[PDB]
Amino acid sequence: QKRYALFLATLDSEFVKKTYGGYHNVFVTTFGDEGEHWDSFRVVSGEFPDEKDLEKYDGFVISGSSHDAFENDDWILKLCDIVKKIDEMKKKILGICFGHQIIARVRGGTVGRAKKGPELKLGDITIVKDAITPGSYFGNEIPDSIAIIKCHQDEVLVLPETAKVLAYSKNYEVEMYSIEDHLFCIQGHPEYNKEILFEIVDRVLALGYVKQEFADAAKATMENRGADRKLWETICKNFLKGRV
Amino acid sequence: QKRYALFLATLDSEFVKKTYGGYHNVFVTTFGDEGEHWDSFRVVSGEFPDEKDLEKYDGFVISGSSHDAFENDDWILKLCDIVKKIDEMKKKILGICFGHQIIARVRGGTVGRAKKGPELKLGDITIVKDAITPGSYFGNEIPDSIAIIKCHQDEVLVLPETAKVLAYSKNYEVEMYSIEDHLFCIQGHPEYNKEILFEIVDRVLALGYVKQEFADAAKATMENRGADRKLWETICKNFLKGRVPTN
């Protein structure tokens, strides 16, 4: 009987609540297969599993957040201690955006605002093919690059010593990385889609937080192409469910 | 013919553009009097006055921002450089929210995420009355406290060594402060009102950045009362325009 815990470090948005019924469903659509049990914990509102229950999960996913992974709010510190414990148990954790950065912070890396500005867009990341086995999480043919909806408010400015870089881009050396066999981290959102992106852009535009030109460029990146969604599902599930 | 420079560290929101025509208008409605020339620079977009033009301003106002004053984007570093020159000239600068934080950074203070978490609401600040002269910026009768629409994402976590604290709140020792006679800084927005605040709360709510109850608590602070808007206008104009003795 397979069990997976999702740590929701963001609230549900109006668009995500109305269109999908919330981030729980978004994650479960993306990374779930039939027959598994998915428990989510709204860690952003201070809800966590008990320490003693961690052993029954076959793996964990840490979502994105509007919070920064360098902040010191009580629920972030508690998430760092929980992740440390999970890590010591050698349980699988997939970290997405904020989640990638949380794992890095727990492993002694440094997270801060992105040197090369924010990103809200579809982009491409270059695979370090030398660091991947044919037949492992990445499939048989390993592509040169993979398209993903990027999350680049923050970044990992100093990489934990134990991390292996699996992909990079021109403006960021840490797009994807693994630690040992049980931590796997991506600075983009496999679980996002064009509708989710376009809604965020329009709202942050209306707020006055980005220029109209930047918004128009962000959306333009998904006018004629989407992310490699099927490949990300395959990679992420192979890692999290030990499927090699 | 008095001239004032406005540094807009923020873009115009949709609500503010369609209701008032933009933040230039909101700042000028708040802080301006007829017969003045106000120039605004969109510093957030890297637009700045020429150095040689600093000398013709009678004063400067630095706006709030959605960016953080501890960040190191090129326009921020350039703002910090320009503020240093203006400070060295001893020209008047009124810093609001991010602007308050930028002046603190230039004068060697530390800015960072608010110790006790964010704030998006009408609040009250307790005045350090011993630090104020009757007849200066706050009038003959110094108030015990003032209501202001708060900006508490970030804060000044370590005060500049030359800062005089003018007001505080339970959770933050630095609501308002001066440096010498030419720098005046408020962690709150005199230029905001109820409509602007509620629009921000609704939008950050829809985005998923705050809880329904945090939004409802924010809005509740302004259901039956507003900020001390006329008093803020008198205070800030008294300082920026030298209308009364310096504190």
Structural domains for chain A: 3-240 (3.40.50.880)
Compute the 3-state secondary structure of chain A and give helix, strand, coil in percent, each to the nearest 5.
Answer: 35, 25, 40
For this entry, resolution in Å reads 2.0
Give the Å distances, CA to CA, from B94 to A226, B13, B43, B103.
Answer: 47, 22, 15, 9
Q: Which residues of B touch A113 (CB under 8 A)?
A: 68, 71-72
Structure tokens at B110: 């530390």
First-residue to last-residue Cα distance in chain B:
25
Give the Å distances, CA to CA, from B138 to B13, B63, B83, B162, B191.
Answer: 31, 21, 25, 21, 17
Residue type, position B176, single letter: M
Three-state secondary-structure class, residue A20: helix
Q: What is the DSSP string of B127-138?
A: E-GGGS-TTSTT
Chain B contact probe: residue of A8, A10, A11 with most B CBs at under 10 A:
A11
Residue type, position A54, single letter: L
**CA angle in degrees (0–180, nearest 5) for B94-B100-B103:** 85
Q: Residues of B at the A interface (Cβ-Cβ below 8 Å)? A: 10-16, 45, 66, 68, 71-73, 113, 117, 200, 203-211
Which residue in B115, B186, B127, B109 sits closest to B151, CA to CA? B186
Q: Are B46 and B10 in contact (CB under 8 A)?
A: no
Q: If you measure CA to CA, which chain B residue comes closest to A208?
A: B13
**CA angle in degrees (0–180, nearest 5) for A197-A198-A203:** 100
Half-sphere exposure of B89 (CA within 13 A, CB side): 19
Specify which residues A61 forms β-bridges with: A6, A94
Three-state secondary-structure class, residue A221: coil
> Residues 6 or more apart from A207 whose CB is under 8 A from it?
B13, B14, B66, B200, B203, B204, B207
To the nearest whole Å, the CA of A206 is away from the closest chain B CA by 5
Question: Would you tell me how many other CB atoms lie within 10 Å of the CB of residue B91?
Answer: 17
CA B14 from chain center: how many Å? 21
Approach to solving: X-ray
For residues A148 and A171, give the distance between their C-alpha atoms in angstroms, rounded to a whole number. 15
> Would you say the C-alpha torsion B122, B127, B132, B135 has a positive or negative sign?
positive
Buried-exposed string A2-21: b where 16+ CB fall within 10 A, e elsewhere: eebbbbbbbbbbebbeeebe
Largest distance between two CA atoms of chain A: 50
Helix axes A212-220, A194-207, angle to 10 degrees: 180
Q: Which position among A151, A175, A189, A236 bears the catalytic label? A: A189
Half-sphere exposure of A163 (CA within 13 A, CB side): 28
